[PDB]
Structures are given as C-alpha cells and as structure tokens.
C-alpha cells in the first residue's frame, strides 16, 4: 500500500513537472532581451547608524518609512529614527538571543524572539515610562526564526520546529498552525493585502500558506540548498528567494515555475537576505561575502554592488515608500543607502 | 516645531548613558555554548557551579560567566549554531564511556571546527564521567578496538600525568579518545582557535577554575595574535 502511494506520488510529481513543461513555451532570458538595461546603480551610504553592542540579526521598517527596529544578540532592541539618526527606545529583552523583530503597520507594537521560543511583543506607546512585554507567546518547541504582524492583533511566526503559527495576543494562544515543511523555517513574506504568505524552510522548497483556512495551496522547488530568505514582488503574484546555493530564483505564483535564475560564476557564497524596490526591477540580495549585489530582476545582470560592511550582511530592508534601502551586518552597523 | 527635536535629542542623552552602563556589563560577562548529548552529563557539571534554553551564571574571582545550554530545540543545528559565533568558548562535553556514540561526538566536533562562522571560536573539550570509562575498560568485554582498530597500535603519550594507582590500560584508552579529538583540531586549526581537552568526573569539586584558566588563555591569545606574535 505504501509502495503503491509512492508510485502514485511519482506518477503525479512527474505529471506536475509535465504541466509546467507544456506551460514553458519560452524562458525569460530572451523575452527581456529587447528592453534597455537601467545600467549602473550609483548607490552610496547616506546615514550609517551606530549603537548596537553585538551583531544585529534582523531589522524592519515602519509604514511611516522613518522608524526602524533592530535586534542584536546582546539583549537590546533599539527603535531608531532614520531621519535624525536617534534612539526613541532601547528595549532590554529577557533572553540575549533574538533572531527576529517586526514593526506593526499601525506602529503600536513591536515583536521579537529567538532561542527562548517566544515571539515577545512590546508596546511602544505604554502610558508608563519604560516599555514592558505586552504578552509572552510561548508554545513552540523550537527557536522562532521570524515573526511578522498581519494587523495590530494577528501575528504570523516561523519556528525551528518546521511549523508556522498565527497567534491571538489578547487570549495568548495560537489560532492556526502551519505544518508541511520538513526542515526548520527561516523566513516569511506577507502579501500587500496580507491575505496570503509564503514560507521557506531548510528543505530547498517554498510553500504559500492561507492565513484564514491554514493549508498550503501551492509549493515551489528549484533551489539546491536550504532557503534563507523570501520577499514578495510588489505585484504580490511572484516572489524571489535567496538560498545557500549562492543563487536567487524568482517564482511566479500563477505559472508555478522558476521563471529565471540569478547566477554569476564569481559568486560562490550563500545569500542571507533578499528584497525588492518599490518598482521591483532592482532585486536587492544581501550575501555573506560581506557585500550586497543589486540584481536586475528582468535581465539577470549585476546592476550594482553595495560594499559597506566588514562582516556578513544579515538582514536587508527597503522602505515601503521606496526612498531608501537598509542593510544590517554582523559588525552591528546598520547602513542606509539611497 | 523645533522644540521637539531637542526633546528627542535630550532623550538620546539618557538612552546613550544607559547603553554605556550596559557596555561594561556586556564585556564583563563571558558567553559559553554548552554542547554534548542526553547521556553526556552536561547538566551534571552545571549543578557544581551553584554560584527552551538553560543559562547558568557562576561568579569566579569577580568574573561573571554565562554558560548557555541549548536543550529544548530540535537536533537540526546547522542554522541556530550560527548565533553562537560571538561566544568566547564552546564547552563541548562528551560521554567518555559510550564507545558507540564517541565517533558521533568526533563528527559533531569536526562539524564545529571547520564551520565558516565557528572557525574563530575555541572549543573547551570536557571528557565527562571519566570514572565510568575506567570501570568498563577493566571488564575487557567492551573493547575500543571494535569501534577503532587504530587503538591496537596506540601507546600512551610521553606528556602523560596519570594519578597514582591507575591501570596503564585505561590511560591508553583515556589518552586515545582525547588524541582522536585533537587529531581533527590540529589538522584544520592554525592560530584562529584551539581545542582545550580536559578529564573530569562527577566527584570533581572543580570545572569552575579549570574553565576560568582555559578562557584566560583564549582572551590572552587574542591579544598576542593581534600584533603577529603567534
């Protein structure tokens, strides 16, 4: 019976690839040949930040495009001001180890967590002097790798137990669990509408999850090694993915195929972070070769390079309005670029 | 209005003074990753220093340590181990007695030594429950030769300091398993990080000083290696 189901899986797995080969009447290599390249991007540091004691791991912009959060592996979560290069808050965490942080679109709360297995949510506009832990969301068996706000109350979490989970912060229990991944989950990417998200884990595959119903509608594969980061294309109907195989792959949700690959012979190091510009032409990919390469998402060409850091580029954000780009690194220095 | 931007600027002065206070305490504390296995007696050592994570702070000579055990998380440790690259020293504890799982401990040690992010971090090896290893060797039914035929043609090293009234057979076993770990360490580590092998047992009233002396050497060597002295 198990053997029969494996044979049916082989019959269906090849049938899935057979459907894509029928759909794949061309590749994006020769479709985008006609368009003129942007050419070089003159991208330079504008507002280099400084103040974290140990390596930063994650950062996140607000909707205002002004305040940014940062986590470092010392137990500090400083909320900066990009415009004035100043610290509005500096939040001492219970656990020193924190692998994630997220700013609410409303800006009311900021979430973070790590090896404690808790997406500890902090309220910025508390009537008291100092900020306090709003609610301890414990329950996951494994380290929390990312958590991101859907809305003021809804929070999506990734973990090292191969499971995503959405929580209700008022009651303090997880509403829906997302099971399916074989390896530990690294990153999340919410849609513009926050109706769907994709989620990469250490299995060289990506799965788009439904937030409400809680089942994987579609799966993507193509990567050779464990996934590191994902971000949606501004459309919401495609996304790129950085992995340890030192290549990024853009995946269309509709076409269900790797449309085109970001490969250079020279690059051998893994990819840590990926992000799009507001237009989505410039795929900002952060490598652990101590720099971040600006990929042409249409032409698969190195548009530009941002050599700013002496250590691994950890995290990389773009502002929602798309004025500026941030990079975090293991040197504890946030560089802002424009 | 311009008044607010001084108020936030003044707010940074109170922020920044608190960061400077936290800077001293951050450098004063030493981070330690405690690694091993369920049967390795990692927690048994922790009980001696009474002074899903388990941190243990112990004060020795007004030097605070932060020994971080990682128990709760899954066995897949290729992605969360990267977070412990700022740590001064990995406390790698091993079960000396269990010959089956020693070779797995050799792979786990070899998996750390050659990692890109863990190449700079020195490993303090603790051969735990040494007393139990000695007692099983004297039985003679459990032979290391079954798991490592290379053991047959291994003599005790000259730089051996056995305790009085010990059987020479145990020291060959005892110094082979160390030497097996150090074979990886020396073959792939050159200035950037060093293995510190140690014997230890349950009856030891120790491992707070012995760790302190090994961490002292790690920090001292960091200075010396700055101006090309090693």
């Amino acid at each position: 019976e198990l053997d029969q189901l494996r044979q049916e899986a082989e019959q269906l797995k090849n049938q899935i690839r057979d459907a894509r080969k029928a759909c794949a009447d061309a590749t994006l290599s020769q479709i985008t040949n006609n368009i003129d390249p942007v050419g070089r991007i003159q991208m330079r540091t504008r507002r280099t930040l400084r103040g974290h004691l140990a390596k930063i791991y994650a950062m996140h912009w607000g909707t205002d495009s002004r305040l940014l959060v940062s986590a470092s592996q010392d137990g500090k979560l400083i909320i900066w001001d990009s415009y004035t290069t100043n610290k509005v808050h500096a939040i001492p965490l219970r656990s020193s180890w924190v692998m994630t942080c997220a700013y609410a679109p409303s800006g009311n709360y900021v979430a973070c967590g790590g090896l404690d297995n808790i997406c500890s949510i902090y309220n910025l506009k508390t009537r008291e002097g100092n900020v306090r832990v709003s609610r301890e969301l414990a329950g996951h068996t494994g380290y929390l790798s990312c958590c991101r706000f859907l809305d003021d109350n809804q929070i999506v979490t990734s973990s090292g137990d191969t499971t995503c989970a959405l929580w209700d912060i008022e009651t303090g229990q997880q509403t829906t669990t997302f099971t399916g991944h074989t390896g530990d989950v690294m990153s999340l990417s919410l849609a513009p509408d926050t109706r769907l998200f994709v989620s990469g884990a250490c299995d060289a595959s990506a799965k788009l999850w439904d937030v409400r119903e809680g089942m994987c509608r579609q799966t993507f594969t193509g990567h050779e090694s464990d996934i590191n980061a994902i971000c949606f294309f501004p459309n919401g109907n495609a996304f790129a993915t950085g992995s340890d195989d030192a290549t990024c792959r853009l995946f269309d949700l509709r076409a269900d195929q790797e449309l085109m690959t970001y490969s250079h012979d020279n690059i051998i190091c893994g990819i840590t972070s990926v992000s799009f510009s507001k237009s989505g032409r410039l795929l900002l990919a952060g490598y652990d070769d101590f720099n971040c390469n600006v990929w042409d998402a249409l032409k698969a060409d190195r548009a530009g390079v941002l050599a700013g850091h002496d250590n691994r580029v950890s995290c990389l954000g773009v502002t929602d309005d798309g004025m500026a780009v941030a990079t975090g690194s293991w040197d504890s220095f946030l560089k802002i670029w424009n | 209005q311009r008044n607010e931007e001084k108020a936030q600027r003044e707010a940074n002065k109170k922020i920044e003074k608190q960061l400077q206070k936290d800077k001293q305490v951050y450098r004063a504390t030493h981070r330690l990753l405690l690694l091993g296995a369920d049967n390795s007696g990692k927690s048994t050592i922790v009980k001696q220093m009474r002074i899903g994570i388990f941190e243990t702070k112990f004060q020795v000579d007004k030097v605070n340590f932060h020994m971080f055990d990682v128990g709760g998380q899954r066995d897949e440790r290729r992605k969360w181990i990267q977070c412990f690259n700022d740590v001064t020293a990995i406390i790698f504890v091993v079960d000396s007695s269990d010959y089956n799982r020693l070779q797995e401990a050799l792979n786990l040690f070899k998996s750390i030594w050659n990692n890109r992010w863990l190449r700079t971090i020195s490993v303090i090896l603790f051969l735990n429950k040494q007393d139990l290893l000695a007692e099983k060797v004297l039985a003679g039914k459990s032979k290391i030769e079954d798991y490592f035929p290379e053991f047959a043609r291994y003599t005790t090293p000259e730089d051996a300091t056995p305790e009085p009234g010990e059987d020479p057979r145990v020291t060959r076993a005892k110094y082979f398993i160390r030497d097996e770990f150090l074979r990886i360490s020396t073959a792939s580590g050159d200035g950037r990080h060093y293995c510190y092998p140690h014997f230890t047992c349950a009856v030891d009233t120790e491992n707070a000083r012995r760790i302190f002396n090994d961490c002292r050497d790690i920090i001292q060597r960091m200075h010396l290696r700055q101006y090309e002295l090693l």
Epitope: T162, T182, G183, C202, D203, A204, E224, S225, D226, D244, D245, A246, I268, G270 | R74, D75, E76, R77, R78, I81, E104, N107, K110, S111, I112, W113, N114, N115, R116, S188
Partner: nanobody, 128 residues
Framework: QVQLQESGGGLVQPGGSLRLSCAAS????????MNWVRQAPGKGLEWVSD????????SYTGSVKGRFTISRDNAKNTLYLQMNSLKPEDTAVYYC?????????????????????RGQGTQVTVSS
Amino acid sequence: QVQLQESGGGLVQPGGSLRLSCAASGFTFSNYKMNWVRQAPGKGLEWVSDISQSGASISYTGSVKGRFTISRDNAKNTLYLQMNSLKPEDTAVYYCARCPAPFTRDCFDVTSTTYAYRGQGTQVTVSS
C-alpha cells in the same frame, strides 16, 4: 527539484559484497560533498563514509574501514559504494546523503532524524 535515487542492496551471503549506487539529480553533483548513513533496526543513525568535492579526502566510521570502498563519478553525476566482507551487524538501511553547502569542509546534521537531503535508502540484508 532535488532527488536522491538509491540502487542495489538486498539479500547476500555473509562475507560477500554489494555495489550500492546513488543516482543524484536536481543539483550540480561535482559541487557537493556526499556521505553514507545507515539505520540499524531499533537504533540511532550513524555515519559510514564521506567524499570531498574533487573526491580525494575519504574517511570511514572506522568500524568498517577496509571492508567498504567509496567513490564518485563527477562525469556521469553518480555516487558508488562497495562492501568487501559483510557482517551480521551490518544489516541496516543505507541512506545516500548530501551536504548542506557547496564549498565546505564540514557537513552538518547529515545523521539528523528528519534531514531533507537524504535518500529513501536501500535495506541490505545478510542471510543464508
């Protein structure tokens, strides 16, 4: 899409030989270091043997050194292993495992419970 398709294994007389072959797909074979792991009935996973990128630095668990011979063909993108004198203890399922990174000297958690880049494995049995 990454697959590892196993071959060989089955019933064989004690002291005999068996040529295992790992058919690798969905990555550049030459770029990754490979590994063998076996699972005994009612026991933990254990490491068997490794291969470098070029296929020079060979190592074994030590219990099976002499009795096993590991190889790779980078030209045909396939991995080999061959036994010499099978013991009753050697009865286990042999999984052909890859490594996470493309230019590393250390593979991490190949012997994990739920590792992703490991084969389904072939049950080798020794009987008369």
